Amino acid sequence: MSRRYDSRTTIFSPEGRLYQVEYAMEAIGHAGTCLGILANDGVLLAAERRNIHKLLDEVFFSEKIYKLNEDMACSVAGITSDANVLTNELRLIAQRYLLQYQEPIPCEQLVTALCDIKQAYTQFGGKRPFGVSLLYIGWDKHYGFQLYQSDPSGNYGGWKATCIGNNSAAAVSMLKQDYKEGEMTLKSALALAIKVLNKTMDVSKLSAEKVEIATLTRENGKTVIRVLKQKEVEQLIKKHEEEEA
Amino acid sequence: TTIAGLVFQDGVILGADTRATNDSVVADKICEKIHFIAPKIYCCGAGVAADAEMTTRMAASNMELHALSTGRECRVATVTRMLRQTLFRYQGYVGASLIVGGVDFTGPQLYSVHPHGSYSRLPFTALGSGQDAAIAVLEDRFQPNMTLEAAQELLVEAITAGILGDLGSGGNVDACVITAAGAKMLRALSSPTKPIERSSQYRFAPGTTPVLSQTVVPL
Amino acid sequence: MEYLIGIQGPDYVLVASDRVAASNIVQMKDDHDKMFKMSEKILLLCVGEAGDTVQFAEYIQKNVQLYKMRNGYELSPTAAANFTRRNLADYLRSRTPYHVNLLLAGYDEHEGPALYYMDYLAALAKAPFAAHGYGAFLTLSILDRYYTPTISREKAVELLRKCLEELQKRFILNLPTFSVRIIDRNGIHDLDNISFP
Amino acid sequence: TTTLAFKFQHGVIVAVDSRASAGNYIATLKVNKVIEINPYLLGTMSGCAADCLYWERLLAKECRLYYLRNGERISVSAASKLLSNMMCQYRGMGLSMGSMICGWDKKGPGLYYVDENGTRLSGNMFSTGSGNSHAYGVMDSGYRPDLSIEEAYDLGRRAIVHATHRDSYSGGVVNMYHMKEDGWVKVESTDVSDLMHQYRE
Amino acid sequence: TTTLAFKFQHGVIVAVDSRASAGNYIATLKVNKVIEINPYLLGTMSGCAADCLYWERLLAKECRLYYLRNGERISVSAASKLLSNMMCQYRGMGLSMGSMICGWDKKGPGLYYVDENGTRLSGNMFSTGSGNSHAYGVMDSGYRPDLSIEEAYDLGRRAIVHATHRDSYSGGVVNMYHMKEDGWVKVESTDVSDLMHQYRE
Amino acid sequence: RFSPYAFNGGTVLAIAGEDFSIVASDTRLSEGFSIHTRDSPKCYKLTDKTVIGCSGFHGDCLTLTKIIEARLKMYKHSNNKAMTTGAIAAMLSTILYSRRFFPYYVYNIIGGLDEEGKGAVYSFDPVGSYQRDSFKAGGSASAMLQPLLDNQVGFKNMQNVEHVPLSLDRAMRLVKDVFISAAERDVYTGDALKVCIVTKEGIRGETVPLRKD
Amino acid sequence: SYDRAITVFSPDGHLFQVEYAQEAVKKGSTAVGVRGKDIVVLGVEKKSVAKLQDERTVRKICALDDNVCMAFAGLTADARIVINRARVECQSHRLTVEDPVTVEYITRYIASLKQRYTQSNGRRPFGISALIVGFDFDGTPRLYQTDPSGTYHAWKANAIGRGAKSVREFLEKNYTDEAIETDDLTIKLVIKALLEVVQSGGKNIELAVMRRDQPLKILNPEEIEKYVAEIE
Amino acid sequence: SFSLTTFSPSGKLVQIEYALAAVAGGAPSVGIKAANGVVLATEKKQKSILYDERSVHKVEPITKHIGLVYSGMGPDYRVLVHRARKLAQQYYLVYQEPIPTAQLVQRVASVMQEYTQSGGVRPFGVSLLICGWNEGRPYLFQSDPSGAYFAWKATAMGKNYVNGKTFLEKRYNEDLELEDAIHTAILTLKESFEGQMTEDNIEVGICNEAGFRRLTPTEVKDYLAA
Amino acid sequence: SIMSYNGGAVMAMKGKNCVAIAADRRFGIQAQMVTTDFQKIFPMGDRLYIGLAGLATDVQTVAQRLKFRLNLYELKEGRQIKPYTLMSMVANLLYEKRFGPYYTEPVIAGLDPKTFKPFICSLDLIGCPMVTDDFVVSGTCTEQMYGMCESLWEPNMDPEHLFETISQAMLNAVDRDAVSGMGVIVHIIEKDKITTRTLKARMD
Questions:
Q1: Does F69 touch chain B (CB under 8 A)?
Q2: Which of F154, F138, F118, F122 lies closest to F186 in space, CA to CA?
Q3: Residues of I in contact with D171 (CB under 8 A)
Q4: C101 forms bridges with which residues in the sheet?
Q5: What element of type H or E holds I203?
Q6: What are the chain B neighbours of H90 within 8 Å (beta carbons)?
Q7: What's the CATH class of domain G9-232?
């Protein structure tokens, strides 16, 4: 209750900015590289793996990639602590949608629902904001294949292709060049993402373990989400190796 | 529902039947009753099935950490106080009738918990709908500190009388022996009913069902 | 007791309702509008307790208008019925129970026409035709005979009048005037108000 | 329970379901609800089954004692009034019986109704039972006194089949009995479900 | 209790009796049942007297707070809806209030009704109270929207006088209030019995 | 106060064969949750060709049977002959109606052979309504016995299968096993079985064991 | 819970909090609106980059009702809370009153939220300022802007965002009785007001118009280039 | 009621940064997952003979098939003990089954997150190392105060944990029996520990098909014979 | 009582390597029938289904709270749920309502994801889980559905003998129930595939 221990996180800067919000995006700026691409025949989301050790297990699935629901999926860049609550809350929100409306949630509704929670904590409560930025993929009955991007300030927007974390501006610069809107399909976008991942990553010897790739597409009226096996990624490495050199 | 237990010289045995019924019909013939609390402490439920189920679940869960937090043996009297305070908190709304017995550092002890929460120490008793059949058998032939084999022959006949003397009690007899050296579980120790067979068999030939719509989804 | 009826055609949904609002031994308002517009192609028919009919249906009216304005597009007929059922189911165990009987009429650009039946216990079931009130016993039986998925609205309106004229014969309450509208790809189309000189 | 009767140019047609249930369990599917009183006179059943079997046989007793006495072949009007008066003395004691009396006389193929409280009515088209309101709809639609013999069977057939479809207490096989000047005759006995398969196609 | 109102070319006319009784004893003969809300807005009373006096003043409170806020001279439609919503929250607690709201707005001389259970209606002619059914008869007979100012007073006068004659709970002096665009005005206050002597001759 | 009725449980079955009629019921008599005795035969033999079952409140089952047996002698002394199975059924209908205001609480099942030698099964209700059917059931397990006899005896809901008229060898094994399955799930059925088969030569009784639980 | 006073007085009576909230309003994107005769026109610049960002989620022109729309400049996160809560209360008004919502009746509620949440315990002042424009009964248009301090005011022509004062200088001088006289003049004036703040603008400029009882209509970019095609 | 943990000018959390630096200097603890079992060997050091070794034990079981060790603050660990054990309780209440190690560590690590947000409270000063046995596959997990839980075949924690990790990196590989897992866990423990090694100085426990059990000082002395 | 408002029937029988579940299509209010298309079986995921009966208000409400816990459980786990795990989940959902309990009798049937093992179970209004080695049924006619499956069930039955047995048990037992009928949907859960069939039934 001592008012000396309060930093008053609601103080505006003389330029009209929030300190705790700006420090949140900086912590996200140190997170590993995560990107996604919206394509005609499907959506592609790939990311690197910064933790590399010979004794690691990783008997689970992906690292920064999560599944929101049957028709949607997400990636993660930021503090893994705040990511677990957001992943839980997103799933809770998407499920609370299934309560009332009993239909797959549109990709626009789930984004604005969490962002209303992010801005509430920066508005009041005295609790620190969230340090995680999230990308969203999926399909809906109205707009179809979708790719979105979220910021810890609660701001979001639609994207055909984007990147978050390390080497974000470098990947965005390449997306402004090679990416062809309304032309390249999911198959061509797969080879393009691998090209961007290899050039923007200064760490050499890209292996199926060091990177992760997940695909989501709709086939025969059913949303098909999968994560490429290390052998399948190694096959793509053999394809890109010939392309590269 | 006939549940009973008897304390003898070297330990305690808790008998129960295998049959559970819902109000018009037998729900399950082989359905088990006696639950797990501690290695040396076991209980069995009666009355409302789900209420006796969930109460022993909260009892086994609370006693589990008491064994993990203390690192020592569990007291049988500790189980009974947990059960009745839950009954007191709901003011007898829970219809769970529970019997608790086992062996502790002090020795073999058997207790009783009424759905209203009253607790009583006693060497032997019975609970459930067929309790009066087992109590009468255990009251006449009981002797202080009986031999393990003498107590086994008596309690099995007590559950047998509680079965044959009750409409809600049937099936096999599950007896669980608990001694100072250790506890041992005997599944379907007694089967008083031989006629497990039938006089005819029913088989159907393929194509005798009027199927209208058909589809196959591969996996 | 108020009456409702609806019919699902191949491309259309034909609904009708009684316009009479009565109290005690007298009919106070005979032109009363029981039809509430949820969306462009989505209508609503609400009858029940006199107090719960208007109050609870206006809650649904704006709650549907909440969704359409937030996301820029209205609920689908299937999405609308399932959200109205949870609204009625939440107040079932509250201290203010709602006695209402609802028919949801709507058209979709893909699945086409949809008609949904709902009771006061919030049990949602899709049916090609449904009706409420005591007059449902004297009408739906006629629909069992004459209904086919290929029927044309020209014959359906004629068969609808044949069902509603039974309310003036066997059914005791007068109910002089009925309101009839249709839903299709071109939107809400009003029909001649049934009048008995 | 669904029972209906209507009169027209060629006489009365009585149609009824076969099913009578107690609670959620169906007691018997094959129950014959139509009571046979006289060769040309035909009764029905509604409500309690035992109340109908008891009292309709007393009516058949009175109709036979009449024909044995004056030999005048008692009219449907006198039979309907005697049945109503017998229900008046016990009114309030819990007797619940519905019924409909059908037959032809010097006036014509009369159709009457007798309620549990003594209500006696006359008209062209009657129905009773738990599914009576479901019967009124199909029967009234497409009905005129000038309907022929074959056209009226299609009306009576679709009457029970479509009414028993919406009722949980109505079902079984359709029993339809036409009425003539000489006497009533059994027309057809057919399952409701078997006719449902022909209407869906 | 007999209260009635109807709208026509020249605006609304509200007519009511003066008598309110408790049991067999008449509490007061001179009770003024018409509630004065706004200069141009006029309420009524039905059922419990205290429930009307309490809630109609809350409506007059809401109408004043609105005109003090936006200065828009609240319409009769908004006043009738706010009165109905206040009766919805306490529904089931035993509050019994009838009422009718009368007034002119940009649309016209609206006439609305609010029941105890929250029923909100709109129409040309309304009446409430224990003698409402006795009012519906005389009012409907010889009524058209084209009635003049003087002809409508004779209709409203004969409405109360002949209705209170057949009701034991209705009587006193006739209070009739015409409605205009500027506001309602008191027309006449006359005993029912004094008018009975003119009608018998 | 005073409860005039109580449910005593039990089950009664009757099936009409081509030349024969079979009637069987259990021996278990229990009220509430307690067993009075494990042998209490409900099946009562009226005449050689007629056997009546009784399932319901036991006090009314005893008295109503003695009333029927009293009217059996009234008939035979008057008419110099035994009652037909159809005559006994229509008689008890008026007997059950005489109590219409305070009805007997019982479920009666009459079975046997008619003058043509064909089995006639007659199921009743406390108010006295009756009908003729090939097979009927009654008692606490009445809901259990009916579906099994619909498929096996009635050949219902089976497409393209040979329909053979009921045989006595199968009819016995069908009545035995439906009660073996009944004694499993019915708390009111078991402890013994008594089967009374009425044929053209005469009545033949049987005893089948059942579970004691 | 967290309970303490956030906004507090200074030696001069000014509120540093509210003043910094208005600074974030100034740094928002430029948005403008103008009252015509029977019509109203809203517009905002868009800062989309490299055809990447989708144009469906960017829209800052929102409709509170069929007869009432709005546009905002400020923090895009705080606007989504106010717009949603305004629509919940605006339709709750139509629950209380069968007649539609007058533009002044929704403005007083909106600005009241900026009043409460500024002085409320532990809360935060909003960093947005929006133009609520719509049509009252008889078809009379109304244009209202809110303030992070909670005040509101009526305007015949108004603008928000960066260079909002510069747009008003254009509006103040060029808005006369000749202005917004017909439809062609209202459309050109709103465009000409945005032509000064054009910086690499092109198609990026977004416009919308509402006419009498017709719902809010968005004017497609192709007709934008046609109306910008006539500058003489 | 105001959050004590805030974002630094560099974006890192300042409070949890000292939490990780606190567990880095705790008691040395090592573990190895090899073949069908996992070996847990920790350091219980007493400053004097008056101390009773049977009264306080550092290795504690969570349940039959799961056990846990720690390096860090004493008091904050017992708070983790009660809540993690109560979490396994509330697990067995709902699911009536033994808890999987992945779900146990997940919701317990979420408790560590709650105090990096809620105000007036410091984060935990304990880094938990969880062992579990489910469906025949052994589990070795590592959790720190930050709330992020990982998985390791073998690792080290406490004072001089970098050496223990590098030593197991060289020495430890696949195809090691539980007997070799104990003797390898002792060798890596001989490096971090200094001084004479007795059965009271080290507290060892294992988890196998028979569940998590703690080793008695008698059989530990048998393993002290190399 | 309240369970008799909407009626309904659910049947699940265990075969040798496979399991079959069946329920009727009828939905009605007391004497008033509504629709023929009602669905009493909802997918719980691969090789796991659940039946529901009783008041249809709680049938559709609990089905959403079970899918509430199902998806959250499947998204948190990396593996599919076992049919034994789901049984205890329904027990917690019904017991937390102990003062207000829902009206329904869920029936869970499926195959053990381990290899081939079939598993069945059913609960009650009080939320008591029960595991049987033969079959489980629930509804207002459940007394009728016993006798069919009691005699017809065998210790081991192939999909040929299993479908023929459960289908005849439905067609015969449901015809004697007034509130049940109007078609029967039968689901066959095998190890290789899953078969769905709609039987021809009387309309009555």
A1: no
A2: F138
A3: 204
A4: C47
A5: none
A6: 61
A7: alpha beta
